[PDB]
């Protein structure tokens, strides 16, 4: 090991791996504890988040061993099977995470489309199981093949595996990184488009309501006229129960008129119900937009630099050449990719589904 990158590695990896370990145990242990708290309602997004956190915490449990490897001067003492498992756990976590994130963004988009619409929980579990099976079967090759002599080396690129990984990169790069990032980019576009259009419509709706209510507030002959115009507009607008409730408000006001204080007072009750109708949409859009922005940032930080540098490192690799500068850049972006496993609970906190509700419930206990 003549190259200087090895001296860099033996100090750098123990630091970042142990930081990720402790931070990731705290975050994921607490997140999983919160998830499993009983709450009157549950959702498929809770399924996807729980699967992500379990995957991340499993991966995090391997990091003290990798740190040990480097702290011993790059000598593996944990046996051949354990080395195999290091490799396998790294890559299974990474791509299961990428797919759980992609599915989560898609789900939030599809939800913001339908704010008023167990059945989908079992489907969420079925989908998770599909993802696990496909990635675990695609990764078993790592389990097939501690190599070194006079010392025991694990975690190292070497001649024996170079051609193999050159082929596998090709697939994982395309199907495991770039295709999901493409899916995310379309999801961002669609989220922004739908959000802008819906909120423009909602502002128009609220504005016309306040116009009609200001007319009723100012000026009984014209009160009935305004209420009948509003009733006709509402009838043409036909959420059957919601429309019926608003129309019953209108009919109660129009009766209290046709029977000036009671009807004008009843006119205000539409305002709070309309504000609640607006807020339902606004909450769905907040959630979808937060999810997609945090997820794109994770991809730009954790996954795309790593896959880029990894690919070039493999393509230019030669037996008797160090390439210490490219190799150092790769080591750093590998740390970032690993660190995703402690970054993800940010998403549970800022875009969870009754996450804070479950947390406040836990705090009561
Ligand atoms: O420390 C250091 O000096 C630096 C790192 C050395 N080092 C250590 C070495 C090591 O791991 O020991 O790895 C590299 C790789 N590895 C790959 O380029 C790879 C490519 C593909 C791959 O596939 C796993 C299974 C993916 C299954 C899958 C999931 C999907 F979602 C979609 C499609 C598929 Cl197919 C694994 C590694 C590339 C460059 C260097 C190293
Ligand atoms: C992942 C990164 C690269 C995404 C950046 C892509 C840019 C080009 C995206 C982000 C938001 C997108 C816009 C979102 C909304 C609309 C309104 C629609 O009526 C025409 C397209 C238009 C104007 C989109 C054009 C493309 C767009 C500007
Ligand atoms: C918000 C999150 C900010 C994350 C910033 C830094 C992560 C901490 C990692 C810093 C570890 C650096 C180790 C190092 O640099 O070691 C090189 C040395 O020269 C080898 O001998
Ligand atoms: C790792 C240990 C964590 C234990 C794994 C948690 C079990 C998951 C579970 O039991 O499911 C809960 C609920 O059904 C969700 O829909
Ligand atoms: C859980 C905590 C594990 C934290 C410790 C994981 C790192 C163990 C370090 C180690 O034991 O390796 C030192 C080696 O003996 C030097 O030659
Ligand atoms: C969790 C990662 C799995 C870690 C594997 C547990 C290590 C087992 C072990 O220490 O075995 C040492 C011996 O050299 C082998 O026969
Ligand atoms: C429902 C729209 C799915 C379009 C995905 C096309 C590309 C598939 C590749 C990765 C995304 C996998 C997401 C599967 C989530 C289904 C809900
Ligand atoms: C909504 C905005 C539009 C969404 C789109 C934004 C995200 C693009 C995603 C993937 C493209 C990846 C393209 C990478 C192509 C590289 C091909 C290449 O460089 O090949 C090198 C060499 O020729 C081979 O051996
Ligand atoms: C780090 C960056 C986090 C950026 C998170 C951005 C969250 C913005 C979401 C939002 O404010 O909602 C917008 C929508 O118009 C309301 O309905
Ligand atoms: C909570 C946060 C936990 C994030 C922990 C690690 C992220 C890895 C970040 C890698 C830090 C890159 C900086 C670096 O590696 O510096 C090299 C040094 O200059 C040698 O020359
Ligand atoms: C590596 C070591 C990590 C192991 C410790 C991490 C904690 C893991 C799971 C904690 C969550 C358990 C919660 C069970 C349900 C409790 C409840 O329903 O109130
Ligand atoms: C992530 C580090 C390496 C992990 C290797 C694979 C471990 C799998 C662990 C947990 C997956 C949980 C499986 C639950 C999904 C099945 C649901 C169903 O079939 O209905
Ligand atoms: C904790 C379990 C780790 C086992 C210690 C290594 C034993 C050995 O030297 O073979
Ligand atoms: C999804 C986007 C589709 C990507 C299509 C082509 C990009 C793949 C080409 C880059 C892989 C070459 C790396 C290598 O030479 O091993
Ligand atoms: C990988 C190659 C990509 C091929 C697919 C390209 C574009 C598909 C875009 C589909 C957008 C349709 C969804 C819009 C909607 O849900 O209303
Ligand atoms: C790039 C392709 C993305 C195309 C998205 C267009 C779908 C929006 C049109 C619509 O649903 O009304
Ligand atoms: C990673 C993100 C890439 C940045 C893409 C830049 C394009 C952003 C375009 C529009 C952002 C719109 C923000 C939402 C405005 C809401 C205001 C309103 O609805 O009244
Ligand atoms: C967003 C970065 C993801 C990974 C980087 C880790 C460090 C980030 C630390 C703090 C970021 C906080 C982002 C909060 C977004 C929520 C905004 C909102 O609630 O509307
Ligand atoms: C981790 C700390 C990240 C910064 C938190 C900012 C709060 C965002 C908010 O206003 O809701
Ligand atoms: C809940 C996070 C609040 C942050 C406070 C900082 C210190 C907290 C650290 C560890 C507390 C561990 C909480 C686990 C105990 C179970 C919770 C309960 O009592 O219901």
Residue numbers in the entry: 29 to 145, 149 to 176, 179 to 232, 1001 to 1020, 1023 to 1041, 1058 to 1078, 1084 to 1106, 240 to 322
Q: What is written in the article reporting this PDB entry?
A:
Cysteinyl leukotrienes LTC4, LTD4, and LTE4 are lipid mediators of inflammation acting via two G protein-coupled receptors (GPCRs), cysteinyl leukotriene receptor type 1 (CysLT1R) and type 2 (CysLT2R). CysLTRs exhibit bronchoconstrictive and pro-inflammatory effects and, therefore, have been recognized for their role in asthma, allergic rhinitis, cardiovascular diseases, and cancers. Here, we describe four crystal structures of CysLT2R in complex with three dual CysLT1R/CysLT2R antagonists (cpds 11a–c) and the results of extensive mutagenesis and computer modeling studies. To facilitate crystallization, human CysLT2R was modified by truncating N- and C-termini, inserting a thermostabilized apocytochrome b562RIL17 into the intracellular loop 3 (ICL3), and introducing three stabilizing point mutations: W511.45V, D842.50N, and F1373.51Y (superscript refers to the Ballesteros–Weinstein GPCR residue numbering scheme).
The engineered receptor was crystallized in lipidic cubic phase (LCP)20 in complex with three antagonists: ONO-2570366 (cpd 11a) (2.4 Å resolution in two different space groups), ONO-2770372 (cpd 11b; 2.7 Å), and ONO-2080365 (cpd 11c; 2.7 Å). Our further analysis, therefore, is focused on the highest resolution CysLT2R-11a structure, unless noted otherwise. As expected, CysLT2R structures with antagonists 11a and 11b are captured in a fully inactive state. All antagonists cocrystallized with CysLT2R share the same 3,4-dihydro-2H-1,4-benzoxazine scaffold and bind in the pocket in similar conformations (root mean square deviation < 0.3 Å in the common scaffold). A key anchoring residue Y1193.33, conserved in CysLTRs, forms multiple polar contacts with the benzoxazine part, carboxylic group, and amide linker of all ligands. The N-linked carboxypropyl moiety makes salt bridges with K371.31 and H2847.32 that are specific to CysLT2R. The hydrophobic bottom part of the ligand-binding cleft containing the butoxybenzene group of cpd 11a is formed by side chains of TM3-TM5 and, in case of cpd 11c, extends to L1654.52 and I1664.53. Interestingly, mutation Y1273.41W slightly improves CysLT2R surface expression and potencies of LTD4 and cpd 11c, however, dramatically decreases the potency of cpd 11a to inhibit LTD4-induced IP1 accumulation, likely because of a clash between bulky tryptophan and 2-chloro-5-fluoro-phenyl group of cpd 11a. Comparison of the contacts of these substituents in CysLT1R-pranlukast and CysLT2R-11a suggests that in CysLT1R the cleft opening to the lipid membrane is restricted by a hydrophobic ridge formed by F1504.52, F1123.41, and V1965.45, while in CysLT2R the replacement F4.52L removes this restriction, making the cleft more open.
